[PDB]
Amino acid sequence: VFNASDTWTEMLIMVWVLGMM
Amino acid sequence: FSRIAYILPANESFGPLQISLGRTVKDIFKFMVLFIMVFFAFMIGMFILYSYYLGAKVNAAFTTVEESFKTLFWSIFGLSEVTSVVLKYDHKFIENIGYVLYGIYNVTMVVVLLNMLIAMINSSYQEIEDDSDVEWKFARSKLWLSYFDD
Amino acid sequence: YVDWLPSDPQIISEGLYAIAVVLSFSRIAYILPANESFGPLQISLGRTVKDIFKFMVLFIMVFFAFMIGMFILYSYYLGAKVNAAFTTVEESFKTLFWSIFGLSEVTSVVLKYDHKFIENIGYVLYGIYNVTMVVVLLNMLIAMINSSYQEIEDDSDVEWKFARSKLWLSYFDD
């Protein structure tokens, strides 16, 4: 949600979903 | 004007009405909590989808969070229109994504939640019977018992 | 190297991102039944979904049946109706889906060429679809759900206990 409204956040979300997988 | 409920249950043919009203309100509280959960879930996705279209839709739709709340609230009653999904830039892919998302929200949320509510209310009714008179008597007892002391 | 497109991977990325967001926000059902006042709710929800699956299959059967006829009726009217209605299959799906909720309009049947006969045929067909499908299928669904409820009673606590048991039993081993 924080990334939704107005680079680091993108990579953090990617790392989180990689951990889920 | 809504505060009249104090002097309503003293009468005969109106007590059980009020009592079952309160009962069903207390029951549908939890269904309201789950429905706002799914509402939030759909509305965040809908605000992220059309976040980068300022002035590209037909109507003033899906531009800010306040407008998303407006449309997703007023569509529960059939008062909002489907034309709130059409675009002006071609981008046919995003257009189909939005049609699909809006439709699936509509069907799922509205239909399944309504049928759950009514079937579970008939459930919660069919188990408790014949004591509505008792509950109305208890309420009316509290009512004209509070007038004695001072 | 130096010193807005029709089909760009950026828009596709955003569009898939939206579906992924909605799915992850819907994934909260794992940590829902652990609480007290919320288990039986989820359990009856799953039960009614599994029940209405078959009603959905029959409803899409009749939907297909009506929509093929409606696409054959106005197949030879390209630019003759009032609105952009009943011209291609995608548009037929659109109107027949969005009329289930009262969001589609009746003016999606009026023509511009006179052909009064085909106009009445279309009004009759659209009306009879509306009445039959919507009303009879909804009343069947609700009466049969109250049926499937009235036979099974007092074990909702049991089912919620079984679900919650699976839930915090999966946390022990590893």
UniProtKB/Swiss-Prot annotation, chain B:
<comment type="function">
    <text>Forms a receptor-activated non-selective calcium permeant cation channel.</text>
</comment>
<comment type="similarity">
    <text>Belongs to the transient receptor (TC 1.A.4) family. STrpC subfamily. TRPC3 sub-subfamily.</text>
</comment>
<feature type="topological domain" description="Extracellular">
    <location>
        <begin position="52"/>
        <end position="91"/>
    </location>
</feature>
<comment type="subunit">
    <text>Homotetramer. Interacts with ITPR1. Interacts with ITPR3. Interacts with MX1. Interacts with RNF24. Interacts with JPH2; the interaction is involved in maintaining Ca(2+) homeostasis in skeletal muscle and is mediated by JPH2 'Ser-165' phosphorylation.</text>
</comment>
<feature type="repeat" description="ANK 5">
    <location>
        <begin position="12"/>
        <end position="41"/>
    </location>
</feature>
<feature type="transmembrane region" description="Helical">
    <location>
        <begin position="28"/>
        <end position="51"/>
    </location>
</feature>
<feature type="transmembrane region" description="Helical">
    <location>
        <begin position="92"/>
        <end position="117"/>
    </location>
</feature>
<protein>
    <recommendedName>
        <fullName>Short transient receptor potential channel 3</fullName>
    </recommendedName>
</protein>
<feature type="topological domain" description="Cytoplasmic">
    <location>
        <begin position="9"/>
        <end position="27"/>
    </location>
</feature>
